[PDB]
């Protein structure tokens, strides 16, 4: 893994709208994102 | 009404100069060729213009390696 040519990559936590948490690394430096639908609440996954 | 042809380069007098079994001196030209029709074998070098020459004294031999014809020099026993 190269030293600095590789862009930063920090672990982050996200919370969906239905209230499901999620932890994963993403380019977002803030570390706290707010996702709306997510796959735990999307209609396609849930049913119908 | 004439011909667009009529040109031709000098014959380059290529080919094998020392054939199998001929005793040659070191540095002797063995094959004048374009490309490696024959490849440099043992005690045989390849010139800039693809001229195969003997690197050591001996007798010219023609062999085959990996399906490629090669020119080798077999050392000649001292008398």
């Amino acid at each position: 893994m190269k030293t600095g040519i590789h862009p930063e990559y920090v672990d982050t936590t996200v919370q969906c709208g239905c209230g499901h948490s999620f932890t994963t690394r993403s380019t977002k430096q803030s570390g706290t994102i707010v996702v709306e639908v997510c796959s735990q609440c999307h209609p396609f996954y849930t049913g119908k | 009404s004439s011909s667009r042809n009529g040109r031709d380069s000098a014959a380059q007098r290529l080919g094998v100069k020392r054939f199998g079994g001929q005793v040659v001196k070191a540095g002797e030209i063995l094959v004048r060729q374009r490309g490696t029709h024959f490849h440099p074998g043992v005690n045989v070098g390849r010139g800039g213009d693809d001229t195969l020459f003997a690197l050591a004294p001996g007798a010219v031999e023609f062999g085959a390696k990996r399906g490629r014809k090669t020119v080798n020099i077999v050392p000649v026993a001292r008398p």
Partner: protein
Amino acid sequence: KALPRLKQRYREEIREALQQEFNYANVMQIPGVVKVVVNMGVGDAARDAKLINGAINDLALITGQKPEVRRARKSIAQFKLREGMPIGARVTLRGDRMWEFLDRLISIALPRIRDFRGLSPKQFDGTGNYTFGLNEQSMFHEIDVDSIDRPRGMDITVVTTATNDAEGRALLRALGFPFKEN
């Protein structure tokens, strides 16, 4: 220690589920997803080469590592292409980053897709790999929709050790990919 969500799920449950479904003579046949390749082919770079920089930045922000800029191995006059013109960007994800990108792509992006009704599970390679294309690039939180430039039909593909369409679909369903079952 640390372990991605999807990677841990695969190491703990998915292998057993796939073994039970497609009983293999040996454990080593258990399909295991391999490098995930995400690409943006510009095509119009011949008219606006600047789009390559935006594609590079977007791919970096989406994946986590720099995108390799891929030139053209051919020069077809029909599309104004010459040998060496940067014509796309490619990112190969392997290991922890691969699994984390898969986890994010399944848990964040695809649900955020506009009018998302899933993709038919017929785009599999026929040898175990699955390729599809995202209709935009704003679904990823790293690509903030407020500061986007244009739409880039984003090619994605996942390479697996599967042997064919059946094992590939079994693996991806186990990983939890949306599928427009048909």
